[PDB]
């Protein structure tokens, strides 16, 4: 499309998220969600083809249903107590409705089914935006009403999300599906700590966004969308594969990498609330995510796969365009464990 129109659409998506973040009236939060959805659809279809159109229609259907139940929750809340301010819900029925709407907006299980297919349909830049920016508004709304949520439902969806992401990622050869299932698991981890500490939620969100940005930018740099296409990357740009392996090790939660910081703190916080079984189950389950990250690392950087002859010509060209902040993202997603006590900044 036109660069001016694309810039306007991206700015409108940003403004929808910000309108959600800065408003105190439920109608304006709903309007921000509407504006965000309205401007997000063309971005998913920037590269026109049947797959992107199918992904966009699936995404529109899910987000429109979520917005309708969001509106329904707001009206029910209004009926019981005549308040428009975003605070703890005055009605139990309204709260559950609100919780499932935001679960669909985030992609938490069992409302996860759309994430892998939409991520597969769209390009890599659209996938980066969808898996990083499109989680800020629902999570901020959840943070604002965390004192209202029923812990049973919320923790049930969190544990289900972790299990589903771990299991579904094991069956994937496509990289975008792997990213989608990883995002589902990380949403589960983030939402498992809302009832107890929203600062831990924000810390996990920031760490995850950093790692996801690094991973998507590295996948774009070596323009690969499958396992075998990435297996050729060592034959042209081995530094990219080494950085990708270190980032994958970090994303699996291996100390002393950055990705160990959230789970550790989250586990620690839950232990403060006399919750022992759930964090244990969550860690043993995150081992599955680590397994398919390790499989990707084996296929990419720890072994050298057969190449092709036409690759020789690719040896004679450089990347014309660069991702700025890619080195910063890699460094921040691998080596910020010693800076852990900085979370008191209420990040």
């Amino acid at each position: 499309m036109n660069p001016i129109i694309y810039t306007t659409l991206i700015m409108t998506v940003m403004s929808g998220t910000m309108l959600v973040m800065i408003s105190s009236h439920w109608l304006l939060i709903w309007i921000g969600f509407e504006m965000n959805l309205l401007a997000m659809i063309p971005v998913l279809m920037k590269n026109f083809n049947p797959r992107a159109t199918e992904a966009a229609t699936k995404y529109f259907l899910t987000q429109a249903t979520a917005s309708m139940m969001l509106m329904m929750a707001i009206i029910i809340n209004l009926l019981y107590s005549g308040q428009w301010t975003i605070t703890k819900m005055f009605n139990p029925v309204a709260m559950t409705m609100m919780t499932m709407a935001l679960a669909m907006k985030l992609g938490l299980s069992p409302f996860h089914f759309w994430v892998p297919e939409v991520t597969q349909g769209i390009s890599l830049q659209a996938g980066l935006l969808l898996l990083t920016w499109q989680k800020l508004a629902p999570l901020s709304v959840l943070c604002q009403i965390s004192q209202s949520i029923n812990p049973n439902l919320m923790l049930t969806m969190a544990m289900l999300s972790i299990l589903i992401g771990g299991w579904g990622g094991l069956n994937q050869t496509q990289l975008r599906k792997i990213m989608a299932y990883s995002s589902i698991a990380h949403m589960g981890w983030m939402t498992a700590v809302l009832p107890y500490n929203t600062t831990m939620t924000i810390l996990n969100l920031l760490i995850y966004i950093t790692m996801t940005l690094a991973m998507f930018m590295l996948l774009i740099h070596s323009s690969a969308t499958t396992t075998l296409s990435l297996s050729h990357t060592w034959n042209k740009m081995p530094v990219i594969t080494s950085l990708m392996m270190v980032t994958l090790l970090s994303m699996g939660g291996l100390p002393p990498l950055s990705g160990f910081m959230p789970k550790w703190m989250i586990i620690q916080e839950m232990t403060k609330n006399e919750s022992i079984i759930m964090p244990t189950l969550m860690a043993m389950t995150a081992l599955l995510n680590l397994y398919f990250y390790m499989r990707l690392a084996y296929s990419s950087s720890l072994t050298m796969f057969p190449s092709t002859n036409n690759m020789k010509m690719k040896w004679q060209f450089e990347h014309t365009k660069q991702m700025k902040l890619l080195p910063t993202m890699i460094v921040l997603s691998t080596l910020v464990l010693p800076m852990t006590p900085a979370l008191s900044s209420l990040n």
């Binding site: 499309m1 036109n2 660069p3 001016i4 694309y6 323009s223 499958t226 075998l228 296409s229 297996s231 050729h232 034959n235 042209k236 072994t303 050298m304 796969f305 057969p306 190449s307 092709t308 002859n309 036409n310 690759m311 020789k312 010509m313 690719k314 040896w315 004679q316 060209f317 450089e318 990347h319 014309t320 365009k321």
Partner: protein, 320 residues
Amino acid sequence: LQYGPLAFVLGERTTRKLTETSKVITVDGNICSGKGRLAREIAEKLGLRHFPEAGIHYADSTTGDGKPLDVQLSGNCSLEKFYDDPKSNDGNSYRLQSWLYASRLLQYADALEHLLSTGQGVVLERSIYSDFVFLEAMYRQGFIRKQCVEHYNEVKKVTACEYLPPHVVVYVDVPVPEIQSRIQKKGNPHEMKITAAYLQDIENAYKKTFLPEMSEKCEVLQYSAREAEDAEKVVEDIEYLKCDKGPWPDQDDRTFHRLRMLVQNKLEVLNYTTIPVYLPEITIGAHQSDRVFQKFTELPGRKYSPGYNEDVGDKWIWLK
């Protein structure tokens, strides 16, 4: 300021450069026909840039130094051994075909980049389109397998689905006996081993498939040997015709912007030339790939980016 979205935002529009002289012409003729002499003449008369036919080392001439590299680093194939032993066990035939298609694709990208960035039209020899005839010929002589042609079709589909076909296609028709005589008087020992059937197959391919499919979407000037030396008439025919059936009139400034971003960034052009389908003729094992890539890096000006090689003579490294 390299061309990008910001340049298009400020001033850069390439529809203001097109002056009806762009008219990308491509010339196709059977081996040993004087298409090259004719193509050069057409480019001389019309003011266009001539692109000599891509070889095994075409890409070597656009990057770093223009000198070709070793065969083991650039192409890993030879036409001479193809002529000598077309049915060899090391798969030189299909590796040669694939490398030449990649070179042709790369050349077309450079020609499109020039035409879009400056407005001056270009003239080419055998392009990505009509590259397949050597393919079909190699299959009809039994030189290559069916898996090779299916892989070629996959790569050609995925790559050629993104570029604009040429306006004018010029075919010089020379019968197989005449080109056989031209080869015999050429004196090249390897070219003399081209069998009659192979030449016929190449001729057959243009007539059976290339000429008819092209005629449906562009304008064709099929010429015989005698009618090809007098280039004034050829230029007259080129200028008289008006292209109104191709996709080119439908293109506009937004499509031009996308295409101009595609033609530069040669890594994106060559992205699908290395799809991970494993044909024994073109797939290379890890050890050989590793040592050959190491050797390529050891080349004088190839360890770093072009402006960061002290050995060739780059200065002020610590401030670039």
